Paper text:
Removal of the two ubiquitins, through isopeptide cleavage by the USP1‐UAF1 complex, is also required for ICL repair and maintenance of genomic stability (Oestergaard et al, 2007; Kim et al, 2009; Murai et al, 2011). While [name] ubiquitination precedes [name] ubiquitination, [name] is also deubiquitinated at a faster rate than [name], which can result in a [name]‐ubiquitinated ID2 complex (IUbD2).
To address these questions, we used our in vitro reconstitution approach (Arkinson et al, 2018; Rennie et al, 2020, 2021) to assemble a 1:1:1 IUbD2‐DNA complex, from purified IUb, D2 and dsDNA (61 bp long), and subsequently determined its structure by cryo‐EM. Our final IUbD2‐DNA map, made of 139,601 image particles, was at 4.1 Å global resolution and had a local resolution ranging from 2.8 to 13.9 Å. The most noticeable differences are (i) slight movements of [name] and [name] helices in the region where [name]'s ubiquitin interacts with [name] and (ii) the high level of disorder in the [name] N‐terminus proximal to that region (residues 1–170), upon loss of [name] ubiquitination. We thus propose that the high level of disorder in the [name] N‐terminus is a direct consequence of the loss of binding between the ubiquitin of [name] and the N‐terminus of [name]. We reasoned that the relative disorder in the N‐terminal regions of [name] or [name], in IUbD2‐DNA or ID2Ub‐DNA complexes, respectively, might be crucial for ubiquitination of [name] or [name], correspondingly. In each case, ubiquitin's hydrophobic I44 patch is involved in interaction with the other ID2 subunit; however, the ubiquitin conjugated to [name] forms a more extended interface with [name] (Wang et al, 2020).
Residue numbers in the entry:
A (entry chain B): 1243 to 1400
B (entry chain A): 172 to 249, 259 to 398, 408 to 557, 573 to 686, 694 to 724, 729 to 790, 797 to 935, 949 to 1113, ...
C (entry chain B): 194 to 311, 336 to 372, 377 to 590, 602 to 613
Write the structure that this text describes.
Amino acid sequence: EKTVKKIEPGTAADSQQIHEEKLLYWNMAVRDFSILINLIKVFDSHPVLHVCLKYGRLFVEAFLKQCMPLLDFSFRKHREDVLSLLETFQLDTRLLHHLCGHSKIHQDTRLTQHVPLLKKTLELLVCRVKAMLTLNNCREAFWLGNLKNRDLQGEEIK
Amino acid sequence: QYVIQLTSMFKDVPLTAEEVEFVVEKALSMFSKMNLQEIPPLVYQLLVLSSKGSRKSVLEGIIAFFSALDKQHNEEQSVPSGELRHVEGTIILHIVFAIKLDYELGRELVKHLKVGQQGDSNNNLSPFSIALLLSVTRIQRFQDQVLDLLKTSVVKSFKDLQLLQGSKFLQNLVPHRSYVSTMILEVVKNSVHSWDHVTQGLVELGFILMDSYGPKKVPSLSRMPNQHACKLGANILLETFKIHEMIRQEILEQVLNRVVTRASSPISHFLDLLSNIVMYAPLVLQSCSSKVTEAFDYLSFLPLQTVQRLLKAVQPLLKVSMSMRDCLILVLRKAMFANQLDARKSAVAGFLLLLKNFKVLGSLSSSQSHYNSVANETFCLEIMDSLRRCLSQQADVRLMLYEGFYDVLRRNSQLANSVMQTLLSQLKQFYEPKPDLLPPLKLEACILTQGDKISLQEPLDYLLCCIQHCLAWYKNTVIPLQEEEAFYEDLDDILESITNRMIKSELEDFELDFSQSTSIGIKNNICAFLVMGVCEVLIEYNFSISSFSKNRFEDILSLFMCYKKLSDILNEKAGANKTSDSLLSMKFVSSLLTALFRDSIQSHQESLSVLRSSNEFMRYAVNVALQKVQQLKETGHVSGPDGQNPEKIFQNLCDITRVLLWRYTSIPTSVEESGKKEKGKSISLLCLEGLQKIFSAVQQFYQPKIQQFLRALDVSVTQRTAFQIRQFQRSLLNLLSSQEEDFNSKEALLLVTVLTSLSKLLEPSSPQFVQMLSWTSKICKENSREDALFCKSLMNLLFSLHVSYKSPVILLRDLSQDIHGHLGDIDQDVEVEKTNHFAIVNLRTAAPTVCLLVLSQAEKVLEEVDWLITKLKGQVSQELPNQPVEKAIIMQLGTLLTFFHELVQTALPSGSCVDTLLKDLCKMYTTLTALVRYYLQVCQSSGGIPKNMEKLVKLSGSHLTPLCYSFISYVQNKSKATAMARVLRETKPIPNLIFAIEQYEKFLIHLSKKSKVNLMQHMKLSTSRDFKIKGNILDMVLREDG
Amino acid sequence: TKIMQLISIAPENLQHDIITSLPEILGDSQHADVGKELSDLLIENTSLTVPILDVLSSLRLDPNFLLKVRQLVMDKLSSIRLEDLPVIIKFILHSVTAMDTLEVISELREKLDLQHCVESSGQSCIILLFDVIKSAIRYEKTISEAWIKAIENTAHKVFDLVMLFIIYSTNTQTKKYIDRVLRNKIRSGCIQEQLLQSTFSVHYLVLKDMCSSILSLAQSLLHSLDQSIISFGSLLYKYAFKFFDTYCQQEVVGALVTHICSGNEAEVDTALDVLLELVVLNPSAMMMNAVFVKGILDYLDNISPQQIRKLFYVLSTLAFSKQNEASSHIQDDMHLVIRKQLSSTVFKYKLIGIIGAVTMAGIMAADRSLSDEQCTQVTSL
DNA sequence: ACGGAACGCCTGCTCTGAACCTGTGCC
DNA sequence: GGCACAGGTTCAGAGCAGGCGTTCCGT
């Protein structure tokens, strides 16, 4: 969280030579965030997922605040890589929502403490993606779907 | 009692476990039985024994006992004795010395009595507690803290009263025992009984409250929290000044210390306080001669409005101190040549006010008087010589001078013999003597020709205005009351010549037929204003002297035709410039309207047939009446004479109201029969405009005399206003049953605005309110016209009536089905239509207009709900009548949830409406979270849960919870640097809704944990969305962009 | 024509007299032409310039004509004596538009002659400058706010700091705003410490008229926990004590005793340190201050034992700094009250009494490298 | 061994009024 | 076809609450 937070967003006037390694670092960061998050299942203990909730909401909030201006500036130049890292973060967001559902299903005050702000920032990232599409004169391209309620192991529940 | 004393002495040893029980049980035992005189010694014993420990345990007991004694006295007086207060004065002093001895006691006391939330007070305050707080305010450490506490308590209580008066649902539910405003007034009344330490607290609280929330922009969010609260401060500054003699010499200095100093922001409330204290007891102003003396030196550097009321206030001082009068006139005459415009205007207003107040004992006409009559006379005459110096100055000074000479003449008659001559000199500065000469005005001398700019010097229209009013006053009063008389008829001859030459005049003389582009156009426009003003003042004069002669009214018609073509030429030039407050006097306007419409005498009718033959004058009379009432809207004063008198202007205004109402009532629109150019400008529409404006102004200004107002317009005021609302209702029914293709939308919305304005006068419980409610319901259910504004006004009227009648929630539910039927659905697989609920709803007006109004009313009832549940949490913190209140809350939420469930499927237009819907959804779910939060505190103590909220939770989960997610998905699915602001603005509410919903999920999970009922089984899992990008659209848009 | 003839022919005293009488003689009409002609005289002559500046301030002229004289006189503002200055700045402050405020404020603050100028006439002229500034600031709001905005843009002059003090004193509306601005300025470190000493050296007489306002300012700053602000407040308190007469020296200790009675640890520590260095600076003034130490001694309960460890230091020092009947009756009553406090068997009263008594005995007994009577007295107690 | 609760400070929410401009309706 | 009218949008500022921060106690 500290490492991703400290990196500032380059401006649109900045050259693509300075944007490209930024996006590469962002792609690496989200990839290792994904492989870190996918290790929750092996240990379904209280404190590990408890810390995971708080630091996940912090990480996605930092990603929202910093990366999204860079995506707004550099969508046209690096569209395919932007979609690739957005798809990877979509996988990560699906994992986060599944963790949220697992926390909500298991009645637990400590786990449920960090849920609503997490969902707020996650949904606000979704609406920020919509805003990013709108800023690039492609609001019609945006679309939504309902995500299935899969538990930690990856199986649908009623 | 000796047993109590010896046990108290024996208990001086340090003990905690048994000592607290002994002192509290003995305390309540002596509170329940002992004599009044033996309480203070027992008070000393218990407070000194409680110093060892358990201070608050005895503090709450004693303060509650004295509160109970206060309530006992209140119900007894509503045995009584003065000494009941006096013993409290002996008691309170000692305990505050304990507060002086023990600071932690005061710390815990002010900490407990802190209003943590709006209901945490729960009337914990009391007259004795307020007296204790003010005594603590005497001590310096907790002075600012307790003052802020009292200020916040007053603000919260005023907000609570505003909400209580804003809806009858709380009145039915909650008692009306909430009041701290009258608490301080009762404390002030009780301070007569030798409570002198309290007075410092009263003055400090009053001053901090007064200067905190005063107006600064010169506030619907804090209308009563701020403005009325300032009045409460002002009220106590009056009340203590009426009661406590010693403090009278103090507070005035502080007032002066503000009044001279804070010259930037408005100080009007302090001015009104100063006027009311000096009016009540001006003798105290003799004491502070030095303070007013040093204040007078600053008169060149004050606002004029401060100067008017200050110099009006200091007049009783001027009646005695002749040396101070000489000093005052010295600083005024020294202030004449100051280059600051405000200083000059201030000095001249002071001149006119002081010469107005000094009465010349010889032959002055009555009232509305120093023994040295000749001294007064020579003083007034030298002041008039100073005014002769004054008059040759810039335009604003002259305007104020001529405005004030009428009041000077009214309150002082002898000086008129000079004033008119002075005015005649000014008249002789511009009125040519030869009748052969065409103009009575020289444009060069009239206007200040100067280098690189043009400005007014001396308004000749105002000269003629003042001359006419003074001459009419003298002819009406002094000559009937009764060497140098000749100039009077000479003035008439002068005006007669100024009449004649003017009717024979033309635009060629004044070089007309011009704007701010060039100085030539500027002077021409100023001359146009001047000739218009003097022409209408000549209309005033000729109408005054004629006594209905045919030739005189022919002159009036020609003169007014000249004025009309001048006005038309100015309007064509414009097509700021048009707006000119005409000089027609209020009395003359009323008399002209009454003569125009209500006329029976044949000799009058002979001239009035010629006068009324031109409809332009008929429009002009009502138009100047409109302008006068609109001027009255912003301030009590008016342009014409008698601006200061409220009684005279109101009594005269009643006449124009009844005359104009008769005009509209007895004349239908068919009588007009005018062309379409002036049909919109028909005098009936102007009449309705005037009726709307005046019926909005009257109850705003003249609240106490409403009964006499309505009586003079044509028992209880409800039965009286039943008549007028019935005629207006019949007129509305006739208008709305007209041809469907088109209708007078302006007339309809003006009329329903008049209905809304007059409806607030009605007593809600009377049958007249029921009749109005039923007729409005019939109109809404039966009629459907294509006009957004008309439907909006009718909806606002209906809701404003209904909220007074009862809760609007049933009407919310019944309108919900209608809006859902008219608009549609987001699924496009379910068909809904129920149009019989309210025909006023329409597919052309349901979405943009009706939805905002109904959502705002929904937000209002949620505001009521969250205030009420906050008070429930407060009384929970305090400690079973709340069950019916809870049932009412649950029913209201259930029906409003049904309203939400009906509307949420609807495909509203994208824009502000969906944003308001999302915000109001957030408000609803936050109130639900507050409700379950309230349940968490009480059911955990009880260990069980009732069966109502379970039904509420299950119906909420079945109706609205997944439907919210579906509607959010629809909202995003419904497709279309400066734009960045809008894009970021429209990013928050959709996340905020799920944040509220999940907050509710978390809180009900906690409720299930702490109540052993799995309420989560009722609600389904939180459906969540994921975004997708259509690559084909990106390819197309990038290809065409490239 | 008559006035100009008298100006041309008459000597310096008579022409000066008619000039200073000009606003009363002239009516409204002759303002512009007479103004242009006296500006021509300003171009011609220099001796009578200051009275012409006075009447130009008094008389009614438009801003466009005032611009020329403003441009001519701003150059010479840097090269005029102290006796001339206050009426020139009176003209400048009362002959400015709404938009030109920041420019002229910055320019006049840069062109100040007090740095090189600073007899009794000089100090009288300085208070006349400050009275002119008080009159101008009190009502000309735009100039008032533009002063704070200009110095905030500037982000060190003593004259500016005294003007800042009186601005805090007079305008109640700028109270919290100027308090925050002063806190920001002292936090930034632009306000050095020596300029405080020089300010109190040069403008001690002027500062007395608002010393109550500076006491309120320092009292407000005491609540702030920043070390720089605390040092600033202590410096202001000690300078105000050491420069002003017995009056302000009484109200400062009257405020400090209440600050000690507040009981907050930072406030009580700073107040005790200020009192100790105050007694070190000048015990003679503190000798008259007798009721304040009694009030300090009365509220033994609020003051913590750590603070009591050094609280007795100050009172014992000022008591035994110089032998006097003042010291005698300051010593006998405190000795009696601590003796009877020790006489009480309560452990708290015994603790406070013994902590006071040991420090008292040490302070009176200690000396640099003491008669037989003093030895007997200290041994006996 | 661990967490929430309590309460002082702070950011950042919420309203508020005004200026500003396009869009509408009409001549 | 363009003016005058109006409501919308935008904004900067005023004012304040919860939630972080920290500590203590219950769990």
